[PDB]
Design a protein around this ligand. Structure first.
Ligand SMILES: O=C(CCCC[C@@H]1SC[C@@H]2NC(=O)N[C@@H]21)Nc1ccc([N+](=O)[O-])cc1
Ligand SMILES: O=C(CCCC[C@@H]1SC[C@@H]2NC(=O)N[C@@H]21)Nc1ccc([N+](=O)[O-])cc1
Ligand SMILES: O=C(CCCC[C@@H]1SC[C@@H]2NC(=O)N[C@@H]21)Nc1ccc([N+](=O)[O-])cc1
Ligand SMILES: O=C(CCCC[C@@H]1SC[C@@H]2NC(=O)N[C@@H]21)Nc1ccc([N+](=O)[O-])cc1
Lengths: 112, 114, 115, 115
């Protein structure tokens, strides 16, 4: 249920393929960046979500923010499917600025 | 300088290869699990670290914890070469338990076991 | 703005008073009451930015002790429907061996209308 | 074991009094640089070797400066000759809704009784 196009509350577009091997591969758009990650290819069937995560390093051929975001979350299936995530965005910093290297937030992705 | 075998303060083993276009691939042992991630393949040249992240889903041929961890951090080269990270570990939960789905912590990786 | 009774998406009840000096006091009931204390910016920017704040509950009261504490860090956002948007850290007391898994993280959004 | 002066890895000083029923009150200096803090701790921790859960908040306004932000530290106190308070923290800045996605920094501080 994960493969396809997803949208978050900021209007970002998360395009992903969930491979048989547990891989996530795709692109993330605020402008498009590569992502890769992993998901549980044998989730519980007890009403639990499917655990997953992915990373975008914010460099493409045109731009580079010298940073990377990881999203950690779970896919929740059904008629109103969602991927509910929390994320960590680390910027490359000097040692003096490392204490403020990392932003934290939460994104919810929907198929609509 | 990211490619290699790293260990964190818990004694976990992070074996990683960094590709020229930003890919991270390898294994993690907290009995290995696959990892994949991304890193900044052209970092600033002003002393700043190199941003990176990776994911492990905690399923292999022997175990499944129905969970995934992402590490987000930066590689710092030089005399004290290290990868400093923070991580989010999400377990698959029912909706009723979703509020407690996610653990947070911080791991520092070096080339020497603890 | 901040003073009042708030509810999060879980249906928890956050009863808070914001003192002129920057103090937050009150009670929290997660879906009996627990004591909370915290702080807020009592002279926020006047440029449309939210008001930074945070508070702590240690999960011990007369009835129960979970041996844990949550801190919520966030901002009050004035609006047609006023919000307090937070992220939180819940640390349980653990042995050293279990310290790696001591801390849950999440996010709660509060309004003065119960969902 | 919590009342007293604590120092973290950044050079900050955390001065706190732990009251009998769970109050934390004191001051935090990220080095004019002193700010009020308040929080809560578990005043009846487990007796199985587990740490003592606690949390506190600083809003970064004093009489001389206002950074329009607040940090909460959530963690546990671990006793012994080399007592420590191990924390994770969330620092929320007041922002517009458009910048709210980047409102919150996260990190970790270790406090000890010596510098
Ligand atoms: O490094 C960056 C790159 C862009 C990050 C977009 C974030 S990823 C989490 C969230 N979910 C989304 O769909 N989009 C946002 N930007 C950046 C980093 C730091 C600051 N800063 O002011 O500190 C400003 C911009
Ligand atoms: O889901 C799991 C799988 C194993 C996670 C190992 C974590 S990854 C962050 C940290 N860094 C490491 O090198 N190792 C640890 N375990 C798990 C999850 C939740 C709970 N729990 O009690 O909630 C217990 C075990
Ligand atoms: O220690 C506890 C005490 C209750 C915590 C309620 C949390 S505070 C963040 C969130 N917002 C709310 O309004 N309510 C929830 N419970 C607890 C801690 C850990 C685990 N665990 O399984 O790890 C289970 C229960
Ligand atoms: O809002 C501020 C006020 C000072 C925060 C000090 C932090 S509290 C967590 C950590 N532990 C310490 O002892 N000290 C640091 N500063 C601030 C906020 C954001 C940015 N920024 O660049 O985004 C810069 C400075």
């Amino acid at each position: 249920g994960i493969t396809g196009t997803w949208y978050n509350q900021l209007g970002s577009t998360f395009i992903v393929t969930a491979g048989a091997d547990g891989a996530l591969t795709g692109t993330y758009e605020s402008k498009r960046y590569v992502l890769t990650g992993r998901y549980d290819s044998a989730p519980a069937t007890d009403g639990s979500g499917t655990a997953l995560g992915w990373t975008v390093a914010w460099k493409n051929n045109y731009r580079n923010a010298h940073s990377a975001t990881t999203w950690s979350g779970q896919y929740v299936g059904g008629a109103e499917a969602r991927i509910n995530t929390q994320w960590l965005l680390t910027s490359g910093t000097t040692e003096a600025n490392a204490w403020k290297s990392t932003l934290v937030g939460h994104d919810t992705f929907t198929k609509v």
